[PDB]
C-alpha cells in the first residue's frame, strides 16, 4: 500500500549562499522538515525563506524549519516547474516520518484507500445550542 | 522610628521584588 520512499542522505542539496532565514533552536530541540525532488536540469528557484538557489540536476534535498514553508516550496516546484516532490518530518531522535503526499497521490485527487476523518453527516445549521453541552467537556461542533 | 520611613520602602521596593520573583518562579516552570 504505497511503501513511502525512505529518506536517502548523501542526496545533494541546492547551491545556496546562506541566509538568516534558515533553521533555529526549534530544529535543534523539537523538529524540522525535509523535502526532496528530482530536477530534470540545474535551474534557479526562489527559496521559501530567503533569496534564490540553484537546484542541481539530480536529487535535491532541502531542510526547512516549517511544514508550511515546505508545502509552499512544493507548490511552487509543482506548478511553475513540473516536478514531483515529497517531504518528511525529522525529530531530534533521528526518526523520520514521511509526510506528503501521504498515500502516493496528491490530496486533490480522490483515492480509494482513504477513510473519513472529521466528517459530520448533517448541514452546519444543525449544531446544538451551547446550553445543551454546558458542564460537559464536549464542544457543540465536536459532536 | 518614623513609621513611613520603613513601610513605604518595604512595601514599595521589597514586597514587589519578593512577590514578583515568587510569581515568576511559580508561573514559569513545569510541575
Amino acid at each position: 500500500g504505497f511503501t513511502p520512499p525512505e529518506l536517502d542522505p548523501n542526496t545533494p542539496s541546492p547551491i545556496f549562499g546562506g541566509s538568516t532565514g534558515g533553521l533555529l533552536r526549534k530544529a535543534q530541540v523539537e523538529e524540522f522538515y525535509v523535502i526532496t525532488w528530482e530536477s530534470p536540469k540545474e535551474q534557479i528557484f526562489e527559496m521559501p525563506t530567503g533569496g534564490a538557489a540553484i537546484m542541481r540536476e539530480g536529487p535535491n534535498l532541502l531542510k526547512l524549519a516549517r511544514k508550511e514553508q515546505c508545502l509552499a516550496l512544493g507548490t511552487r516546484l509543482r506548478s511553475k516547474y513540473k516536478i514531483k516532490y515529497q517531504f518528511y518530518r525529522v525529530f531530534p531522535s533521528g526518526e523520520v516520518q514521511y509526510l506528503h503526499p501521504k498515500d502516493g497521490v496528491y490530496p486533490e485527487k480522490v483515492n480509494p484507500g482513504r477513510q473519513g476523518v472529521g466528517v459530520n453527516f448533517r448541514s452546519i445549521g444543525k449544531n446544538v445550542s451551547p446550553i445543551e453541552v454546558k458542564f460537559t467537556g464536549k464542544q457543540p461542533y465536536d459532536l | 522610628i518614623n513609621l513611613p520611613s520603613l513601610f513605604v520602602p518595604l512595601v514599595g521596593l521589597l514586597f514587589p521584588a519578593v512577590a514578583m520573583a515568587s510569581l515568576f518562579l511559580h508561573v514559569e516552570k513545569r510541575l
Binding site: 508550511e68 490530496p107 486533490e108 | -
Partner: protein
C-alpha cells in the same frame, strides 16, 4: 490543535483542499453527491488556523469550518 469539520452540504469541488498551506484536508470517496467525493481532515494537528479553506468554499453556508482551539507550536506557526 484547531478543529476542522466537514458538513454534508459539501459539493466536493475540492477548491478548499487546493487552498490549504499545510496539507490538512483530503478528498475521499462518498455517495451523497454527483462527484462521489467529499473533503476529509485527517491531519488537523498541522492546521495553522489560516482558514483559507473557508474562503475557497463556494457553498452557502460553508461546508468546511475551522474552529480555533488550543494552540501548539505547530498551530502558532513559530520557527523558533
Amino acid at each position: 490543535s484547531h478543529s476542522v469539520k466537514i458538513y454534508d452540504t459539501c459539493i466536493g469541488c475540492t477548491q478548499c483542499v487546493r487552498a490549504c498551506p499545510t496539507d490538512v484536508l483530503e478528498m475521499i470517496p462518498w455517495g451523497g453527491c454527483k462527484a462521489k467525493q467529499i473533503a476529509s481532515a485527517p491531519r488537523t494537528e498541522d492546521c495553522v488556523g489560516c482558514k483559507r479553506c473557508e474562503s475557497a468554499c463556494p457553498t452557502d453556508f460553508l461546508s468546511v469550518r475551522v474552529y480555533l482551539w488550543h494552540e501548539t507550536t505547530r498551530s502558532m506557526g513559530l520557527a523558533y
